[PDB]
Scaffold this active site. Structure first.
Site, short mmCIF file in Angstrom:
data_model
loop_
_atom_site.label_atom_id
_atom_site.label_comp_id
_atom_site.label_asym_id
_atom_site.label_seq_id
_atom_site.Cartn_x
_atom_site.Cartn_y
_atom_site.Cartn_z
N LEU A 158 0.84 -1.18 0.00
CA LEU A 158 0.00 0.00 0.00
C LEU A 158 0.88 1.24 0.00
CD1 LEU A 158 -2.71 -1.17 2.53
CD2 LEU A 158 -2.94 -0.98 0.02
N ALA B 242 10.16 5.17 5.72
CA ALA B 242 11.45 4.90 6.38
C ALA B 242 11.46 3.67 7.30
CB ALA B 242 11.95 6.15 7.12
N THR C 145 7.48 -0.92 5.23
CA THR C 145 6.47 -0.97 4.19
C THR C 145 5.10 -1.35 4.71
OG1 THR C 145 8.14 -1.40 2.46
CG2 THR C 145 5.87 -1.98 1.93
N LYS D 136 2.44 -3.70 8.83
CA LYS D 136 3.59 -2.83 8.59
C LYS D 136 4.85 -3.64 8.87
CE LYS D 136 4.01 1.82 9.52
NZ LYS D 136 3.59 2.68 10.67
N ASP E 272 8.95 10.83 17.22
CA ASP E 272 8.85 11.18 15.80
C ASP E 272 7.41 11.53 15.36
OD1 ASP E 272 9.56 11.59 13.22
OD2 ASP E 272 9.44 9.41 12.71
N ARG F 6 3.15 12.47 8.75
CA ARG F 6 3.39 11.18 8.12
C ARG F 6 3.07 10.10 9.13
NH1 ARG F 6 8.74 13.22 8.93
NH2 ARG F 6 9.61 12.27 10.81
N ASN F 7 3.00 10.48 10.39
CA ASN F 7 2.74 9.50 11.44
C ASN F 7 1.33 9.53 12.05
OD1 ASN F 7 4.93 7.75 11.46
ND2 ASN F 7 6.21 9.25 12.54
N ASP G 294 3.04 4.92 15.44
CA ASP G 294 4.50 4.86 15.58
C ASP G 294 5.13 5.59 16.71
OD1 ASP G 294 3.85 3.31 13.25
OD2 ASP G 294 5.00 4.67 11.93
#
Ligand SMILES: O=C(Cc1ccccc1)Nc1cccc(-c2nc3sccn3c2-c2ccnc(Nc3ccc(N4CCOCC4)cc3)n2)c1
Length: 265
Positions: free
Chosen positions: A16, A20, A23, A43, A135, A139-140, A153
């Site tokens: 999908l 970093a 996947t 993931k 982090d 994106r998270n 994450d």
């Protein structure tokens, strides 16, 4: 409350996306004894980072599998083989970053300000659980529906452009450094997925920070909004706002979005 999976119980089906940490796959859980196959999100992480033992990896999984907040993505299962695989409920939308880029200028004040509140509620949950993200970036933040996002994450190159000064200078990570990153996250949203400090090399980020320069005011933001973002980037961690203050402040702004964010539409 964490399912340890054997490769025989699930199966990756399609890729999908890739980033970093690893996947992302659409997968299928094959419950034993049944003829159905249940969709999951898997993931698969990029290992070899400091070759850790499995019991040392599970110790951590157990904690992430212990979160309960509508705005925090929970670990449901884990499969420890050559690679480390994290399983969770499959969502149709992937990360907030892409979502906002895809809907670049057709996203409204109400949505922006709500994601801000939701991200803070999630972050405040983690703070209450005594968990430091490390982090936090758009994106998270995953999208369950466009009106409900979940941070992922927590506790997983170095996202220098998201890090607070002390994390950069001393690898100090606290709830107050998560606040800094949170201000960057908000900035990404308000700019519709722009790259923070576009152009400036990471090597130079400490110096411009130190010299007091900050990410620029997004054109859609009023000063009250920018003011908040900026407070998140004080040098003195303890003078930065708390997530609970952040929930409150953005809650107020979302009560009259069109007053705090200026968008044509
Ligand atoms: O186990 C945990 C909790 C956790 C907390 C603390 C520490 C460790 C782990 N977290 C986790 C688990 C599995 C995947 C992930 C993930 N990481 C990412 S980045 C983007 C999407 N995800 C997911 C993701 C997740 C679920 N479901 C979808 N669905 C979905 C739908 C459309 C897309 N698309 C991509 C192409 O364009 C848009 C359509 C892509 C994916 N994604 C996170």
């Amino acid at each position: 409350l964490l399912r340890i999976l054997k490769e025989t119980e699930f199966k990756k089906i399609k890729v999908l996306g890739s980033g970093a940490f690893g996947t992302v796959y659409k997968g299928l859980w094959i419950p034993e004894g049944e003829k159905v196959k249940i969709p999951v999100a898997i993931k698969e992480l990029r290992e070899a980072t400091s070759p850790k033992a499995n019991k040392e990896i599970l110790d951590e999984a157990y904690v992430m599998a212990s979160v309960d907040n509508p705005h925090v993505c929970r670990l449901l299962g884990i499969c420890l083989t050559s690679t480390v695989q994290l399983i969770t409920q499959l969502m149709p939308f992937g990360c907030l970053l892409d979502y906002v880029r895809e809907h670049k200028d057709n996203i409204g004040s109400q949505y922006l300000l709500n994601w801000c509140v939701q991200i803070a509620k999630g972050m405040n949950y983690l703070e209450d659980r005594r968990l430091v993200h490390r982090d936090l970036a758009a994106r998270n933040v995953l999208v369950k529906t466009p009106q409900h996002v979940k941070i992922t994450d927590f506790g997983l190159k170095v996202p220098i452009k998201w890090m607070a000064l002390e994390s950069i200078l001393h690898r100090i990570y606290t709830h107050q450094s998560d606040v800094w990153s949170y201000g960057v996250t908000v900035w990404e949203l308000m700019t519709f997925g722009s790259k923070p400090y576009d152009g400036i090399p990471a090597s130079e980020i400490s110096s411009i920070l130190e010299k007091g320069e900050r990410l620029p005011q997004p054109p859609i933001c009023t000063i009250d909004v920018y003011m908040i973002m900026r407070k998140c980037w004080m040098i003195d961690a303890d003078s930065r706002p708390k997530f609970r203050e952040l929930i409150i402040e953005f809650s107020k702004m979302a009560r009259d979005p069109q007053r705090y964010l200026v968008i044509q539409g």
